[PDB]
Design a protein around this ligand. Structure first.
Ligand SMILES: Nc1ncnc2c1ncn2[C@@H]1O[C@H](COP(=O)(O)OP(=O)(O)O)[C@@H](O)[C@H]1O
Lengths: 212, 472, 142, 89, 191, 89
């Protein structure tokens, strides 16, 4: 086997690359729970299972072409990242812009109970959220307007899970059923950084010439 | 030479306009643009006036004046001076000689300082709620990412250490406060250390009862010389060695067998805290110039190594680590914290505090209007104008909060007819007038006094100068 | 006015990434000044590699970069939203509403939404893979 | 449909480059290709008239045609997918 | 951002117009002019696209695409892409979102490839008349000075050597073909 | 909704002509009119604050209001219905 391979093996296996067997000793002896010559697409391979510091799980990715290979790798990577993000905070949100609309409804309801010019500032925060459903549908070639009012209708009079399936290019009464899911960990952060940004922009009065 | 005076007044008005909207606990931010293209977004007025591209002599002068004696208060002084300048202009159009306006303003200044001295509420180092409030006062509008009631804690805790009473007044040696910063997490990761902090395998780490060498300062011959230099230091019994100039890694090896820092502003406070002194040339180095540090050490900031000088001899030692995300955050945090430290320090050292929201201002105006008719004709107008110029601050403060200036001014004026509403000021978030003392809107009387004083001085200087001349 | 310019800067920036949103997010072509190119509908890549012009826009870029730093998935979604907020703000400025008011309003709205996120969130079952509940969830999200 | 027309454009241009009337020959071939038994008929440019292109030795590799179609499609989709052009570093 | 898209479409249309008249077995020649003053007269489209003074990114891209996987066929790809771009433009004016046009074109591509796969007449290395015809096909309009039925012979003879069958498909290692040239006489002296 | 806003515009302008802040008073009245028992509350322009307009003798004929609404609606619809202007004889 390659040096780069054996070097990786010994540290997990708790063994040591013996330079000379005459001087060898059980100190250099490694161990693994199971080893098996397994068939893998009519290609026999030695599998090692659950040895010492298991660390990472090893995927043998059998790509018939570099494209499908990198594609599969990419897919697994994205899937892993997303699943990680949802797993870190175990609460899912109805994607396809549904949660934004729900929030907008709730935020208008909340805006009503605030007075002054701030009632209009909050309401204007809601009107911004609803741009995500609008834009997100528009990408699917749907009318940016009628879609939103249709959504509002379906939403205010129905489930909060009403959203937009961009792939299929259609408005869905329940996006969970179409497996459109969004992690909360992402959403809250998006909301945060967005708010911070828009704030920081609005807070700046004007520009001033300075000296380095 | 009116033509030379109007330009001065215009300059002052320009700088006022520059710092105007930054004022208050809802003060907007200004974006500074370097000619390089780099930028600096900030609320703090001093910083602006520092990095600002100053044009006029009178301008640079005004800035030089507003910064003299305490980082904050500059804002107030500048804007006040601007208002006074504008009202002075209004008075000048009425063909009133400057020497009259000056005198009037001086009288007004005296009455103002009397007023502040009269109103002032005596406070002590024990009234920590006041300290907290005063801290939180300047911290508002800083756009600092939370932990205001924690940063204020750190401030209150910080000033407490740096304080010792020889007689009637505690000697708060503010210059003993080290301030550094790093990125990561948020300002909740900010934290104090009793000792000073500074941002090869090298010499040992945990030195107990450490002696600290403070030093600002053919090839084979040079090697011999450098080794001589190192041995000289070694022969003085120095545990840890500090430098400013670049040190040859060979000397690092040597010393390792026996850091180069970057800034002297640290070495300064190190010399302050350790009790040792800096030496220009190691040929003069002794064993008494070495600073005593009971438990020196080093620690890891999440992304970097950092040096800690814990157990410094001097009681009045303190440092703070600042943390956050973007540069603007940590910077605004730094400057804000400086402001806080200043205000609180002045509260402690002076021992008097007043209510913000423009209470003191409308009080001063209220007083001036009463005192105005008691003096001559043309001076009376100047004094009245002074009062108005003071009210201008309340008005601008109202403007920066998205409120109607005049209405709130009139409201406060109406309220301050009662002796029992001498604290009432403007609640900018609420929008309505309220007793600013209960809301923890408290500031050091000394700051207000100084602002008034410096603004008066500036404007009188503007009015006294008749023409500008090139010399050699 | 300068504020409005900044607003327009950030807004105009956000206008570009408006189309790169979601699955059908249109592509953006990045010209590496070295004489090379890379195209993508990814917020992070675009915002990162692109050499932004206006300061406000640069600040929005900064915000986006932070947004990416904290978590990888949502980046464009933040920028488009920011743009939307500013665009909705400039309409309130025309109502002669001082920025600070809008800012506080947005802060409150943000806090409430942040509070409402979990209220409207559907918690899941992660109690082992023996049950296959997790698998169904993992299958859906997959 | 537009795709189909865009394909016919090639026949038209091919007719143009031979000094023939594009549309007429297009219509002719279109009319001829209504029969299953004229699936080889193409345009004889020297003669000027439509003829069975197989007997005349006008033969090309299917793979070439396929690849041309494929690459053209890819190119145009790339053109349409890109919304804006940005300078990077 | 229609303004950025139209420019792309214009670029593609420009390159189409560049290679348009070269198309076919009566394709006219283009005269390439180097900034030095030197020139290159040619029918072959690849050569043009190589020596051509490329302007637009989308252009250089399109050229980079048309030349990817076989020298010829580039012509067809370019012109086809141009036509598709023009018709796409026509479709865009009708307020149709690009992601629809793309999908449609993709479907059309699939059906097209199905069509070619369906129509195709299977051939073998033995059907030399076919090889000759295919050779002669591209050779037409080249303005080569005769010997087409001889150059085609050389081609047919050439490919025959560079061919060995490991399994179902002969491994025609085309890269083993050396090509040199010299002046004197005519192309009948080719060998 | 736009119609409603357009109606509120009148209150706003009414506030403007009195030297008052439009939006604040609008919001105030809007907040007040959440109660069934404040359906008469309007804007006291001299006082500056919202008050029950019935006790203050600020009364108008319903028919006038109705007619105003009616005619305005008719006018705007007429404006919107007309696509182009033509010269006749
Ligand atoms: N919470 C508050 N409520 C009302 N007024 C305040 C408050 N905090 C500060 N102020 C006012 O702000 C003025 C000082 O503002 P400025 O100098 O811009 O900020 P800083 O106090 O940080 O230097 C003071 O005149 C004070 O009356």
């Amino acid at each position: 086997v390659k040096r780069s391979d054996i070097e990786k093996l010994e540290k997990a296996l708790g063994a040591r690359i013996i330079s000379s067997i005459k001087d060898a000793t059980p100190e250099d002896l490694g161990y693994a729970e199971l080893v098996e010559e397994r068939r893998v697409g009519n290609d026999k391979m030695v599998f090692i299972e659950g040895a010492k510091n298991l660390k990472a799980v090893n995927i043998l990715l059998r790509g018939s072409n570099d494209m499908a290979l990198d594609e599969a790798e990419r897919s697994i990577n994205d899937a892993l990242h997303a699943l990680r993000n949802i797993l870190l905070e175990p609460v899912i949100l109805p994607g396809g812009g549904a949660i934004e609309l729900e929030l907008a409804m709730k935020l208008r309801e909340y805006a009503r109970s605030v007075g002054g010019k701030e009632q209009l500032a909050i309401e204007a925060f809601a009107d911004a959220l609803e741009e995500i459903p609008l834009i997100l549908a528009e990408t699917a070639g749907l009318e940016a307007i009628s879609s939103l009012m249709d959504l509002r209708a379906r939403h205010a009079k129905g489930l909060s899970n009403t959203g937009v399936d961009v792939i299929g290019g259609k408005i869905v009464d329940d996006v969970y059923a179409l497996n459109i899911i969004e992690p909360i960990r992402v959403k809250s952060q998006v909301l945060k950084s967005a708010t911070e940004a828009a704030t920081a922009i609005l807070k700046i009065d004007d520009l001033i010439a300075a000296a380095p | 030479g009116k033509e030379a005076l109007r330009a001065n007044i215009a300059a002052v008005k320009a700088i006022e306009e520059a710092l105007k909207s930054t004022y208050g606990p809802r003060g907007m931010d200004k974006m500074l643009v370097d000619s390089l293209g780099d930028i600096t977004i900030t609320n703090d007025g001093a910083t602006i006036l520092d990095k600002m591209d100053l044009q006029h002599p009178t301008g640079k002068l005004l800035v030089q004046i507003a910064k003299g004696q305490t980082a904050d208060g500059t804002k107030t002084a500048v804007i006040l001076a601007g208002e006074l300048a504008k009202k002075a202009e209004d008075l000048l159009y009425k063909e009133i000689h400057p020497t009259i306006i000056v005198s009037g303003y001086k009288k007004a200044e005296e009455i103002a300082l009397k007023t502040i001295q009269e109103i002032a509420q005596p406070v002590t180092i024990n009234d920590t709620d006041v300290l907290r409030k005063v801290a939180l006062t300047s911290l508002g509008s800083k756009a600092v990412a939370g932990a205001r009631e924690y940063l204020a804690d750190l401030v209150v805790k910080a000033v407490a250490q740096v304080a010792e009473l020889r007689g009637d007044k505690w000697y708060v040696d503010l210059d003993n406060v080290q301030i550094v910063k790093k990125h990561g997490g948020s300002v909740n990761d900010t934290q104090l250390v009793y000792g000073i902090v500074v941002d090869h395998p090298g010499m040992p780490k945990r030195i107990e009862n450490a002696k600290i060498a403070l030093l600002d300062a053919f090839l084979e011959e040079e090697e011999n010389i450098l080794k001589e230099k190192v041995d000289k230091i070694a022969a003085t019994g120095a545990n840890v060695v500090i430098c400013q100039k670049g040190i040859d890694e060979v000397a690092q090896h040597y010393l390792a067998k026996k850091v180069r820092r970057a800034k002297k502003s640290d070495l300064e406070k190190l010399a302050r805290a350790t009790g040792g002194r800096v030496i220009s040339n190691i040929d003069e180095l002794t064993s008494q110039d070495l600073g005593y540090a009971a438990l020196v050490e080093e620690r890891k900031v999440g992304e970097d190594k950092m040096v800690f000088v814990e157990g410094a001899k001097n009681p009045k030692s303190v440092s703070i680590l600042i943390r956050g995300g973007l540069e603007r955050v940590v910077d605004e945090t730094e400057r804000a914290l400086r402001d806080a430290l200043g205000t609180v320090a002045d509260v402690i050292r002076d021992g008097r505090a007043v209510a913000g929201g423009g209470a003191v201002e409308i009080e001063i105006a209220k007083r001036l209007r009463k005192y105005a008719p008691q003096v001559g004709g043309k001076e009376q107008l100047a004094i009245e104008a002074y009062a108005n110029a003071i009210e201008g601050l309340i008005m601008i403060l109202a403007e920066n909060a998205g409120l109607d200036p005049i209405d709130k001014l009139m409201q406060l004026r109406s309220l301050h007819e009662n002796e029992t509403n001498k604290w009432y000021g403007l609640n900018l978030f609420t929008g309505n007038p309220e007793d600013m003392w209960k809301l923890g809107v408290i500031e050091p009387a000394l700051v207000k006094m100084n602002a008034v004083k410096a603004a008066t001085e500036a404007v009188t200087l503007v009015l006294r100068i008749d023409d500008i001349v090139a010399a050699g | 006015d300068a504020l409005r310019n900044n607003i327009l800067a950030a807004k105009t920036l956000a206008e570009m990434l408006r189309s790169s949103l979601g699955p059908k997010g249109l592509d953006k072509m990045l010209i590496d000044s070295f004489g090379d190119v890379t195209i993508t509908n990814d917020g992070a890549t675009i915002v990162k590699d692109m050499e932004i012009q206006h300061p406000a826009a640069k600040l929005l870029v900064e915000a986006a970069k932070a947004q990416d730093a904290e978590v990888g998935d949502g980046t464009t979604s933040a920028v488009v939203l920011a743009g939307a907020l500013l665009e909705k703000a400039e309409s309130l400025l025309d109502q002669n509403i001082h920025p600070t008011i809008i800012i506080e309003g947005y802060k409150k709205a943000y806090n409430k939404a942040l509070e409402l996120l979990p209220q409207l969130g559907t918690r899941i079952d992660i109690k082992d893979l023996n049950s296959s509940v997790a698998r169904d969830t993992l299958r859906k999200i997959a």
